[PDB]
């Protein structure tokens, strides 16, 4: 929308007080923070490389807007995915257990055998702890 | 289910008036009809061959109950698949078109390119008419 397109503009202009139409790519973390994102070190490393593939050290508004639209959409889906996670994890243990999965399948009228439900846990359970973390659920959803 | 098992016993007993515990395998079509099936010629051929692998001409109740349980499960699965077909074919053209498939995928928040949707049509489109028939859909739902 245009409202948020303007918030993005305002955040950019914070780092362009001289009106050059570019800002230092090193300001990305603080600019994202201004917009309410708290990107991790690995995310920043990746974005800066992605945004500045020519190695100029500067970014323009169109490129900032492009990256921020992507981060906003990524954020919206992550939040929706975690809404579903909480709907599986109704005992709030912070992991989706075999019990949680079985309950959901029953409530939704999907006839899965214990073997098929166990297959689903195994597919998502990358770390080998026998249950499904938010990171594992995010992974298995975003694919 | 116990009531359904009773109904199957009653249909078997129609063809065993002498109380021998067996009925002629040639009665299968009429026995199945009594139970609300209308098996096609090829289906009868295949079942009779499967039921009477020793070639005796006769079947017992346990054989009959096993096959009727299978057929009932298969009928339920077929009806469910056909319910799904109708949910794709919302224009009631009797075929699932690229339009129907695109509409479904979009409605279910599934992001597929036209190339990916065309690939699904081609996969299911065995007869080469460019859309998906009930038989084609049945086939692809059981694989």
């Amino acid at each position: 929308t245009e409202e948020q397109k303007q918030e993005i503009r305002e955040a950019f202009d914070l780092f362009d007080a001289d009106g050059t139409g570019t800002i230092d790519v090193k300001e990305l973390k603080v600019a994202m923070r201004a917009l309410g994102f708290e990107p991790k070190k690995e995310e920043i490393k990746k974005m800066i490389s992605e945004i500045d593939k020519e190695g100029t050290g500067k970014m323009n508004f169109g490129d900032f807007l492009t990256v921020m639209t992507q981060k906003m959409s990524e954020k919206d889906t992550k939040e929706e995915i975690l809404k579903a996670f909480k709907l599986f994890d109704d005992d709030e243990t912070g992991k989706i257990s075999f019990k949680n999965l079985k309950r959901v399948a029953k409530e939704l009228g999907e006839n899965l055998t214990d073997e098929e439900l166990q297959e689903m846990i195994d597919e998502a359970d990358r770390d080998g702890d026998g249950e499904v973390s938010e990171q594992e659920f995010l992974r298995i959803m975003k694919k | 289910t116990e009531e359904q098992k009773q109904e199957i016993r009653e249909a078997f007993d129609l063809f065993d008036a002498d109380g021998t515990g067996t009925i002629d395998v040639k009665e299968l079509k009429v026995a199945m009809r009594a139970l609300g099936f209308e098996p096609k010629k090829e289906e009868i051929k295949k079942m009779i061959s499967e039921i009477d692998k020793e070639g005796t001409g006769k079947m017992n109740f346990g054989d009959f109950l096993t096959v009727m349980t299978q057929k009932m499960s298969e009928k339920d699965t077929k009806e469910e698949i056909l319910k799904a077909f109708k949910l794709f074919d919302d224009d009631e053209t009797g075929k699932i078109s690229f339009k129907n498939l695109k509409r479904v995928a979009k409605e279910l928040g599934e992001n597929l390119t036209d190339e990916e949707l065309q690939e699904m049509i081609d996969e299911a489109d065995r007869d080469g008419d460019g859309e998906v028939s009930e038989q084609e859909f049945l086939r692809i739902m059981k694989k």
């Binding site: 929706e80 995915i81 809404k83 579903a84 709907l87 599986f88 999965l101 959901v104 399948a105 939704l108 999907e110 899965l112 098929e116 689903m120 597919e123 998502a124 659920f137 298995i140 959803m141 | 279910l108 928040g109």
Partner: peptide, 16 residues
């Protein structure tokens, strides 16, 4: 099946 169920859960929640 994970996507199937997750979306089922979110459909149900919305209808409510």
């Amino acid at each position: 099946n994970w996507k199937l169920l997750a979306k089922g859960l979110l459909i149900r929640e919305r209808l409510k």
